[PDB]
Amino acid sequence: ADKIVAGNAFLSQIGVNTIYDRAAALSGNPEAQYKMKIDLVNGYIHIR
Amino acid sequence: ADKIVAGNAFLSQIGVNTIYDRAAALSGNPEAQYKMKIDLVNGYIHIR
């Protein structure tokens, strides 16, 4: 599916470019509203 | 279901008032037989 909307998701090994919090992800601009960021592609963690 | 009996349960985001150990939960009186307690409603952890 294009988008998976569920409060209960399960992925032991998740292939995701970058992990954002739910509020930032649903806001439409995660890059400017994230409290934490786990960018797996670049390999760095940024915490505001 | 009223009760879920399984040795393998999966809840990434679990909405539960208080978490008890299996032995205390199945004993019928978790409040007097728990070794650890995670009360999410009140926000405190008690370890015996």
Count the alpha carbons within 13 Å of A8 in the hemisphere toward its beta carbon.
6
Residue B5's Cα: distance from chain center in Å?
13
Residue A20 φ then ψ, to 5°: -120, 165
**Which site among A5, A8, A14, A22 would you substitute to test the B interface, given the most B Cβ atoms closer than 10 Å to its Cβ?**
A8
The resolution in Å comes to 5.5
The answer to whether A7 contacts chain B (CB < 8 Å) is yes
Residue B5, CA distances (Å) to A23, B1, B26, B40 in order: 34, 10, 10, 22
Cα–Cα–Cα angle for A13, A14, A20, rounded to 5 degrees: 140
- Is residue B46 within 8 A of residue B37, CB to CB? The reply is yes
**Distance, CA of A23 to CA of A39 (rounded, Å):** 17
Q: Pinpoint the alpha helices (H) of A1-48.
A: 22-27, 30-33
Q: How was this structure determined?
A: cryo-EM
The answer to whether A12 contacts chain B (CB < 8 Å) is no
